[PDB]
Amino acid sequence: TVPDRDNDGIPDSLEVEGYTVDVKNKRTFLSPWISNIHEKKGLTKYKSSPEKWSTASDPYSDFEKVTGRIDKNVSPEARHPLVAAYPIVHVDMENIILSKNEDSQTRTISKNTSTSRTHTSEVHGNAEVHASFFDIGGSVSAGFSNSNSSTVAIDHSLSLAGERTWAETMGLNTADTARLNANIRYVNTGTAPIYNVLPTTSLVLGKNQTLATIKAKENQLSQILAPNNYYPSKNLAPIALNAQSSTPITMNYNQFLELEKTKQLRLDTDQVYGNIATYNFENGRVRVDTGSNWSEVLPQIQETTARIIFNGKDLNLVERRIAAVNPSDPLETTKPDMTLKEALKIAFGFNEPNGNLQYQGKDITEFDFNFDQQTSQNIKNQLAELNATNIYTVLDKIKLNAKMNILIRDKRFHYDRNNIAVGADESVVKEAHREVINSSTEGLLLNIDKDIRKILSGYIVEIEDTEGLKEVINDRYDMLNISSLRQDGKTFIDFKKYNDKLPLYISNPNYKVNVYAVTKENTIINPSENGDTSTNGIKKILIFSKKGYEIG
Amino acid sequence: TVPDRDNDGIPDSLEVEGYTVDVKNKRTFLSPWISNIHEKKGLTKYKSSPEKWSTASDPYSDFEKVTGRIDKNVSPEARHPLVAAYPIVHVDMENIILSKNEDSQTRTISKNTSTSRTHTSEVHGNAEVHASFFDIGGSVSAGFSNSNSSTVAIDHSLSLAGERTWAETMGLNTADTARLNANIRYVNTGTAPIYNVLPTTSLVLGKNQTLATIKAKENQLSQILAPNNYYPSKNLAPIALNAQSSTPITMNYNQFLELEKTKQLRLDTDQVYGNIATYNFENGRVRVDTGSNWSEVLPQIQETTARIIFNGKDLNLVERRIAAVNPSDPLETTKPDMTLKEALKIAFGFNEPNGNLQYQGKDITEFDFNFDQQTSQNIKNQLAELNATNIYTVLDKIKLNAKMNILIRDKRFHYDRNNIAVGADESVVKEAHREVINSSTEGLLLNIDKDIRKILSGYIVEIEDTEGLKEVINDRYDMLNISSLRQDGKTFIDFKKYNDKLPLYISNPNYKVNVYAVTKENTIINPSENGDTSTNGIKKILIFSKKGYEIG
Ligand SMILES: [Ca+2]
Ligand SMILES: [Ca+2]
Ligand SMILES: [Ca+2]
Ligand SMILES: [Ca+2]
């Protein structure tokens, strides 16, 4: 007869005053908090809400989570009563292949691609926006909202010899059509899995030119789209666009032209995910209830939580929602008060090693805090009634309210319009290369930092004469593609890839092999107004500079 | 009113402190462990978990198993509460038949094939892998994961007389298409059976060139895909690809060319298996519940167990999962602690004859232990807090945690990239042939070891002059096909198959009939850069060498 309105299985008090679970003999006991014996064994203080079957709203009873009696695929950090357990999928495009719409074998270009979830914010402050921008809900996207939108970029490097302008390469003239094709893979980034129907992602080019809308058959697949796990298992064959169909991908000269002008496409994905997999106390089985589909129980999550975009695990924007609270909602008050600090602890995993809220090493002060038009005030008003100018201090005293949005990104590197790892400062850059493993007339072998290397477009190999000459090897913007990468974790550079497949030429072993680095933000992808295919107008960074006798 | 949360029918204690079942009069009694009377009659100590309907997760109540009240097809070793009872099917291709896409009768090649489940691991340490390799879940296949992928090889031997280059044999020119066809059979290797819908296996060629996707109609068959039992009962007619259809298998000259260059295809199979067959206490019947399909209750197994790939029953990688435990999961702690030792006992059948954990004869020390990036540490940390360098010792003290992967393979033979019985050392090789049964001018009859013979491509028949000549009979790489095999278990060699159908020619009964053996790893399948169809560049092994008068 123990009091429990929620009916989830966690006696009100316990769920309000704090609780957790351990295993005596070999049984699981749900017991109240005990700062003593408990905080020692390493457990946690699971304080949830008594009036909600799942404080997060997601299809998983607070109990179901902590107890562990739930779909084993649910992300760990989501096994907690206050961490959203919803799926988030975006589309990755590994490589595309442009060809002249039907002896043709070399009349086709095939470049690789780099995809990465995005989170486009607002502009600077001049973009002419329609009057319907300062209305209620109208156009007020608050900078960023709910919707998955990935972004790919086409390898701007070379594929053949002296190729120039995809045009002449393929042979496309005004009255011609080019067919696009590519290999893409769905990949879940959230905290929950999808068991059947995948999303209906649409491929766009530019600001509205849709090139197609990919939505592979429903129920057709029984595979599982688990968290942090690419759909077509990385150990399988990546799905291929219109190539396995009766109407391919049409692209006219003008379009095919733009593609080259930016070498980038966009991928927007809906949210219609297959039904959900739930528990079943009776015989402890994992079933897919045709009666519960995210499309029903998902908006709630977004309407009663705090969203935080952090990028620590890598530079890829990771999303997570915490069980925040709303004042206007009685029920939503039954929720446990939330603090920005506590949040970053369960949401992603920040910890307090020696009393400093850091992340696997980095200090919470190494990341910039960016809020939306709303969240801004809601927090400003707190920093006010708390007398302070530094949030990193009163951090553990910031109340997170539902609908709150926060963007925690590493303060090291610079960021673009989509919030992507663009390129840091020369300082950090150089540092990452300070290490050397093997210098050769063939190519340098370094142990460059991953987090850094990801913001580098390429390297410019040159040679400075003992006087002051700037002779450069791969002098064409498209000759930056050199940096390789052994599976041992060491970046292997090669000068030979752009010098008649032959090693360096040292007429005088007293020169200076100057190998620079070019961050993405700086790198160029197309010739100048004229035909300057040179590395003249670039902002590279000195990464190497050894003498002729200081190599071999 | 006996305590039993799981509700499976095994009183908590019993299931935690150990239990088993026997038959008094003619009834089945579920009783607690008794080292005395019990361990004598030959029973076992079935220690399962009280909070899971089926500790393994599979659709079979711990009780249902031990009690025996379950689908009688379930593999024996799976009748145990801690051994996964899931199905695992891969596709075997007995023989293919290449022909020129539609007087044509000899313009067709028909070679046999050798299929075998695989388990592709990682490379050496240089394969340029995309940056998305050192991310979370991204590309981190951890070497090997969940997915069935078989591999076939095409008989590189001869079919006709002086045939050469399938090309001229069939008559395929640049502007031609070749149609492929073959006879394949589904075969279950797991521990559970499939009662209806078979898997959707896709036939691939190379690294991504899919030649077709076979998925015979659903419900079309009512036959059962029982464990260790080929689908189309070995005593029936093997299923045939596109041959019983409106769109065959297209293959252009360039492709048909590659096929010849490797003489091997790949077979990947999904996991969508038909619904499951469950019990029914009421009238003790075996029914197929449309409400429970593996696709629902199967991921769990892989998310809450230990996977061990052993190859003792043969050289074919056998998979099995044991009811391991996970620390982060309360429920999954209710499980019985697992030890690598105990595992290899129930998982495959290792036993302790005189105190040495061996397998049907071989000692646990005759197999190499290979773990994944994860499992490696999880075990290293144990060998650390246990002070030891040899795992074979502290074997019975290694805690197996869920998601753990282990590869136990015979240490005798060498292994490839797919973990297949390639070829051992000359030593072991020679040994297997030390036995002779009948020497003749026609062919040798031996009782070569099965485990060995499986790593042999063929034999080179030659004759050494009393001086030092190396005259070889079947001197062409494609003339290795000689070793036959009587159903009596004795390998019958024949020199006649490559000598005008006539027996040996002994001009001087004092020579040395040197018959070598060529392991798969060494054997060649195509001519050299030139046209060296000889056995010149080979690494054979001396298996025979008798005198002219020491035969007949
Ligand atoms: Ca409750
Ligand atoms: Ca509750
Ligand atoms: Ca029980
Ligand atoms: Ca049980």
Curated annotation (Swiss-Prot), chains A, B:
Changing residue 501 to A: No effect on toxicity. Changing residue 507 to A: No effect on toxicity. Changing residue 498 to A: Great decrease in toxicity due to decrease in cell binding. Residues 100-124 are annotated as: Disordered. Residues 103-118 have a biased composition (Polar residues). The chain crosses the membrane at residues 122-133, 136-145. Changing residue 53 to A: No effect on LF-binding ability and as toxic as the wild-type. This is Protective antigen PA-63.
